Amino acid sequence: YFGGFNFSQILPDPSKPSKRSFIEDLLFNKVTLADAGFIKQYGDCLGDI
Amino acid sequence: AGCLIGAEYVNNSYECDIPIGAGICASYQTQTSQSIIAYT
Numbered sequence A: 001y002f003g004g005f006n007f008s009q010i011l012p013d014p015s016k017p018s019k020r021s022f023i024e025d026l027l028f029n030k031v032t033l034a035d036a037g038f039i040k041q042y043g044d045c046l047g048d049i
Numbered sequence B: 001a002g003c004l005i006g007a008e009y010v011n012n013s014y015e016c017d018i019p020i021g022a023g024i025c026a027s028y029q030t031q032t033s034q035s036i037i038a039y040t
């Protein structure tokens, strides 16, 4: 209760394992990102699609 | 970032001395007796 101000959509929630807020999840979903690090890990290109 | 050979993983957390990647750092600290450790 911050004087009537809500602050529910910018504070983190314990339900999500990433501990990100409601606005932050929408920000992360709106950007389609590739090459986030080492995802292929020298084995996935051997599984020739 | 790949797997680390030569340094063991401890459950303690300190400041980052040598950055490796993905929130994991390495440092040369005491154990007893001196060895390279890896930590978050």
Ligand SMILES: *[C@@H]1O[C@H](CO)[C@@H](O[C@@H]2O[C@H](CO)[C@@H](O)[C@H](O)[C@H]2NC(C)=O)[C@H](O)[C@H]1NC(C)=O
Residues within 6 Å of the ligand: A006, A007, A008, A009
């Ligand atoms: C503060 O924000 C929360 C959202 O985090 C509001 O809760 C929502 O209330 C509406 C009512 O119309 C429901 O339809 C939503 O499902 C609720 N969302 C939830 C629970 O995540 C809340 O009403 C806002 N205001 C206050 C005073 O808390």
